[PDB]
Amino acid sequence: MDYLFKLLLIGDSGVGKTCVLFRFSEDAFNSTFISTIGIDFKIRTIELDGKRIKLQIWDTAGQERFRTITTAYYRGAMGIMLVYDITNEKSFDNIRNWIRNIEEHASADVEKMILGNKCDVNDKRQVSKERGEKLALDYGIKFMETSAKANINVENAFFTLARDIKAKMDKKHH
Ligand SMILES: Nc1nc2c(ncn2[C@@H]2O[C@H](COP(=O)(O)OP(=O)(O)O)[C@@H](O)[C@H]2O)c(=O)[nH]1
Ligand SMILES: [Mg+2]
Beta carbon of 39 within 6 Å of any ligand 1 atom? no
How was it solved? X-ray
Is CATH 3.40.50.300 correct for 1-174? yes
Of the listed ligands, the closest to the CA of 146 is 1
Of the listed ligands, the closest to the CA of 122 is 1
Q: Which residues contact 64 (CB under 8 A, 6 or more apart)?
A: none
**Best CA proximity match to 3, nearest among 33, 43, 31:** 43
Report resolution (Å) to 1 decimal: 2.4
d(CA 151, CA 154): 6
**What region does 156 belong to: left with phi over 0, alpha with psi -120 to 50, or beta?**
alpha
Q: Which residues contact 169 (CB under 8 A, 6 or more apart)?
A: 3, 78
Annotated binding-site residues for GTP read 13-19, 31, 35-36, 62, 117-118, 120, 148-149
d(CA 143, CA 150): 18
